[PDB]
Amino acid sequence: PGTVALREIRRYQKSTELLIRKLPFQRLVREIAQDFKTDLRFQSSAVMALQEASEAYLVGLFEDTNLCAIHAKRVTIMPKDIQLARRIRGER
Amino acid sequence: PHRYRPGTVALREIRRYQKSTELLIRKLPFQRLVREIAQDFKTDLRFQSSAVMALQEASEAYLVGLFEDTNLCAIHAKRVTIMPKDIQLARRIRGE
Amino acid sequence: RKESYAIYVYKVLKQVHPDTGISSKAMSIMNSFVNDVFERIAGEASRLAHYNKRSTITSREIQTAVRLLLPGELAKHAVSEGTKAVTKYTSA
Amino acid sequence: RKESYAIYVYKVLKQVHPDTGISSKAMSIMNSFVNDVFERIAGEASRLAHYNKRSTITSREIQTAVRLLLPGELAKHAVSEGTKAVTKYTSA
Amino acid sequence: RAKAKTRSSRAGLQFPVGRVHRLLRKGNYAERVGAGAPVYLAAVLEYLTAEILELAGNAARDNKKTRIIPRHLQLAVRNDEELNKLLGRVTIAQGGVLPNIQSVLLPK
Amino acid sequence: AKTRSSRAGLQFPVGRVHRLLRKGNYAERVGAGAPVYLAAVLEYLTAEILELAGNAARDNKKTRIIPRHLQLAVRNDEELNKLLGRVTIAQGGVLPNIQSVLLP
Amino acid sequence: RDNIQGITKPAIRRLARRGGVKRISGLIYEETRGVLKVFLENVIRDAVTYTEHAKRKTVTAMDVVYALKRQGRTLYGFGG
Amino acid sequence: VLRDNIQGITKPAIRRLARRGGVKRISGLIYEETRGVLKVFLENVIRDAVTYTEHAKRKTVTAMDVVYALKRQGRTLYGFGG
DNA sequence: TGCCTGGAGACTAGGGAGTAATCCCCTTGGCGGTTAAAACGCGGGGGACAGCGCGTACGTGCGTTTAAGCGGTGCTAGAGCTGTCTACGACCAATTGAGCGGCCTCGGCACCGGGATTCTCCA
DNA sequence: TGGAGAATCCCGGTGCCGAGGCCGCTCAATTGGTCGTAGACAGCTCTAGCACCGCTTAAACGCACGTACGCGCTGTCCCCCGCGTTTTAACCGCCAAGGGGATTACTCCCTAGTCTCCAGGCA
């Protein structure tokens, strides 16, 4: 257990393709945006920009989370690593 | 004789230096440090006293916030002693 | 010579707390606060005038710059007295 | 009729890499990079003119903004190129 | 000429509408500045100043003091969530910190 | 009728940068050396990025500059990383990097 | 309603293996979904404000780029 | 010529700064790391302050130069003007 | 590759800055007392760290489901451009009054010192 | 649980320097009118956003199982905390020289403004 995980690490870091599916993310954007206005409309490039930004944000957060996990002498990331990284970066 | 347990005096200094607002670095050695750092950029330089006080307030606030993040990193590793890897991790996550 | 928001902050303080004074350093920090928030709102209204290819800053741009900068309840209340002052200026 | 820095990135790329092409998304990234660097240097030079009570932007404000924003060797070679271009422009 | 009424008086404001208008015109923010923009901006500046001055007076009264010092401004800004979020990258001179000790350092 | 960009040895347009500086609400007046200097700095930074992007495309055996090559060019140089630290490049990804204790 | 579950557990694992994470707890996924929802709410609220100022009913890509740009999250490749 | 004034940032001063930051126990290797961090921060701020001084053709670094150098790095300081 | 539109040449005007003289704020350097703070030393206690065991919770592989995605059709909201006009903001002259600099008083608060009330640690 | 010592807090007296109020005056906000243009409004086009269907297939999901890994416990020994004493240099007050920031007046030039046309630039 870990050779397929490290193979997935060496596979996904090299590529630039988006890891979240298109339509569930678009549904999530239209669900979140509905609280601010009713009957909003979205360009497709707007949803693609939101997907690129969200994926880059989550990957940078997981990099800092992994740094916290190695700091606590662990290989498994936990929610306390995420909230510590968000606390230090100023989001929490 | 009477001696306190290790940590009682440290908590007393924590409460004392969190209740107060004074600068915690002596003004003359910080002024001399500012002079030797500024002479590597431009020689024959002069400084207003308000500039050195602004530098000291900024530097002390930066170090206090860094020590808060360092303490969070040390408690994350289930410790009470801050170590240089805590400073390194806080500055790495901050992006410095 | 020099100008500052020293008297207006004192008038606001005596409106709010009639028994409470203010020192010189606290007044200087309040002056820095007012100048900083002025620069933030004016710079955002400048960018919003530039985004819409407009050459005028109006109360609409100041309102949406207040909505962009200030957090939620602060933004709602700041829009409330901004619209109140503009309505009292136009009507009276 | 959109304006873009695309043909000038073509010219600079042909000046440095004759047998290399570029995609549309990479050209969009280069155009956004050019516009972001332009607005950074222009904003810092505008602030430098405002601080020093000057109503004009000369090559000195652009020099100081370039020295403030870019890191070390990039700033040194950038001010070298800018000084060379200004001297050659005044020579012609 | 009639009696001169200031632009702050007819807007019901204490902050100067005309000074804000001059600083907007001379700030190179736009080619044109409208009439309601300085009224709106002076109202917002007065509201934010009054919000800090309420909590700073409360902090000064909690310390049994009359005059507001920078420490009370620090306590007022950091003890209110919206104002701490607005001034998150701001250092108050002679402000200090909130008294905050972690639970794992307190002895059991 | 000679353009000011050819008189400065620059490929970037001096006149377009001057027009953008005039109507950008940066100052009331613009000096004559400011668009020349700004076009030179922008041309230098574009040339540096295109240099490292072409090197990344050549080392990875391709003839086209893609956003992955721009990503590798920006995040591999230290000072370009310091210039573009808070900037995301679309369809660029991240570097291949693994923590040293995770390796077998 | 409840489209945060469309951010699936293998998608969160793909984002973690891109970040270099080798082992992942089972409580990571709900934390990641909440963090993504907070980030999306902030950026989308800013972009909807930018759309409201233009008297427009369509969120363009420019609104998303300026919304990301205000928070220090500048994005290239769309018109930044 | 000034030399080795970073040792004037003493160990009890760093201890006081850590006590303000809520630190209860301090390792003995903290002080050299903290001195290096303080030197890096001061070099970064003072370089832009000196640049702002040199643009004005002045020889004295005023309080405005320090406040603008801190404001350019996202570290706005209230109380010294601006 | 043809139209188009913004850049270039060139003339004028006047204000933005350059420079020289002046004047005085305030920076730097110095001396001496004093005394607070840093530095050094040392005992001990408690916390960092290595080792071990266990119990469980992720990783992984396989079979089943599900809905993402690609292609295709179709409808219409609304982005986007153009034309017209009009109200709104820059601008200018005159006026005048609010704010700023300076001067003066007095009281909020820092300091000091003694006494009552927690508070920590060891029997 | 209790007592010695330490530490914290509370209350009265004293002065001091900075908040705050008053006066002059000046320069910047206000008032009234003029003029051009930015923006609001009306209308039309056609791009593109959205709704829906069919399939087919990669991908999500459920589960079974084993082992790597988190986590609790324990020992130990290093290293940092608390305190006492000594040395060092920070700090306060004074005492000037003078260096350079700030102001003012006059002078040059160069950048805004405008007409025309032509060569880059884009679709």
**Secondary structure (H, E, C), H6-60:** HHHCCHHHHHHHHHHCCCCEECCCHHHHHHHHHHHHHHHHHHHHHHHHHHCCCCE
Kind and range of the H or E element at C57?
Answer: strand C56-57
Terminal-to-terminal C-alpha distance of chain E? 78
Buried b (16+ CB within 10 A) or exposed e, G17-33: bbbbbbebeeebbebbb
For chain A, the helix, strand and coil percentages under 3-state DSSP, each to the nearest 5: 65, 5, 30
Which domains, ranges and CATH numbers included, belong to chain A?
A: 1-92 (1.10.20.10)
CATH code of residue F99: 1.10.20.10
Place of tokens 């000034």: H2
By the 8 A CB rule, do F10 and F41 touch? no
Any G CB within 8 A of F99 CB: yes
Q: How far apart are CA E66 and CA E69, in angstroms?
A: 9
Task: Check CB contact of E32 with chain F, cutoff 8 Å.
Answer: no
Residue at token pair 């050549």: F58
In the 8-state DSSP scheme, what is residue E64? Answer: T
Q: How many domains does chain C have?
A: 1
Q: Give which of G56, A81, F78 is closest to D73, Cα–Cα.
A: F78
Residue written as token pair 């004295």: H60
Q: Where do the H-state alpha helices sit in chain B? A: 8-19, 27-38, 49-76, 84-94
Picking from G77, H53, G59, H54, the residue whose alpha carbon sits closest to that of residue A18 is G77
Which CATH number goes with the domain that contains D20? Answer: 1.10.20.10
Domain carrying residue C36: 6-10+21-91
Q: What is the DSSP string of C3-16?
A: --SHHHHHHHHHHH
Residue pair C59/E21 in contact (Cβ under 8 Å)? The answer is no
Out of E70, E93, E102, the one facing H22 most closely (by C-beta) is: E102
Asked if the Cβ–Cβ distance from G76 to D35 is below 8 Å, we say no
Distance CA H66, CA H47 (A): 10
DSSP conformation letters of E1-52 = ------TTTTTT-SS-HHHHHHHHHTTTS-SEE-SHHHHHHHHHHHHHHHHH
CB proximity B21 to H under 8 Å = no
How far apart are the C-alpha atoms of C86 and E40, rounded to whole Å? 6
**Cβ atoms E57, C9 nearer than 8 A:** no
Q: Least CB-CB distance to E13: which of C21, C62, C85?
A: C85
Residues 37-56/B with CB within 7 Å of nucleic chain J are 44, 46
Task: Give the nearest chain H residue to E93 (CA atoms).
Answer: H79
> Do the chains contact at A6 and F98, CB–CB below 8 Å?
yes
Resolution (A): 2.9
Residue F27 distance to chain D (closest CA, Å): 6
With distances taken from each CA to the C1' atom of nucleotide J30, the closest residue turns out to be E4
Name residues whose C-beta falls within 8 Å of residue H75's C-beta, 6 or more positions apart in sequence. Answer: B58, B62, E89, E91, H45
Question: The domain containing residue E12 runs over which residues?
Answer: 1-108
**H26: CB partners within 8 A, 6+ apart:** B81, B82, H14, H15, H18
The answer to whether residues D41 and F22 touch, using CB atoms and an 8 Å cutoff, is no
Q: Rounded to 5, what percent of chain C is helix, strand, coil?
A: 75, 5, 20
- Measured in degrees and rounded to the nearest 5, phi and psi for residue E68 equal -75, 130
| First CA to last CA distance, chain H | 32
| Cα-only R_g, chain F | 19
- Asked if residue D1 is part of any domain, the answer here is no
Nearest 5°: the CA angle F15, F17, D42 is 150
- Kindly state the tokens that stand for E80: 């209110």
DSSP letter at F63 equals S
Q: What's the gap between Cα B77 and its chain centre? A: 22
Strand F87-89 to strand G74-76: parallel, antiparallel, or no bridges (unpaired)?
Answer: parallel
G66: Cβ contacts below 8 Å, ≥ 6 apart = C47, C51, G46, G47, G50
- Domains: count for chain F: 1
Single-letter amino acid code for the residue at H72: R
Do residues C13 and C20 lie in contact, with contact meaning Cβ atoms separated by under 8 Å?
A: yes
E103 in contact with chain D, both atoms CB, cutoff 8 A: no
**CA–CA separation, D76 and B47 (whole Å):** 26
F68 in Cβ contact with F93 (< 8 Å): yes
- CB D58 within 8 Å of CB F33: yes
What are the structure tokens assigned to C44, written together? 């955002």
Judging by beta carbons within 10 Å of its beta carbon (0-12, 13-18, 19+), is residue H54 exposed, middle or buried? middle
- Residue to test with chain H: of E69, E90, E101, most H Cβ within 10 A: E90
* Method for structure elucidation: cryo-EM
Tokens of D30: 């280069």
C-beta atoms of E94 and B61 within 8 A = no
Phi then psi for A41, rounded to 5 degrees? Answer: -125, 150
- First CA to last CA across chain F, in angstroms? 68
Q: Could you identify the residue written with the tokens 């640049």?
A: H51
End-to-end CA gap in chain D: 33
Class of domain G1-80: mainly alpha
The CATH number of the structural domain formed by H1-82 is 1.10.20.10
How far is Cα D73 from Cα D69, in angstroms, rounded to an integer? Answer: 12
Whether C1 maps to a domain, the answer reads no
Out of F93, F96, F101, the one facing A16 most closely (by C-beta) is: F93
d(CA D32, CA B49): 43
Q: Judge whether C82 lies within some domain.
A: yes
- Is C50 domain-assigned? yes
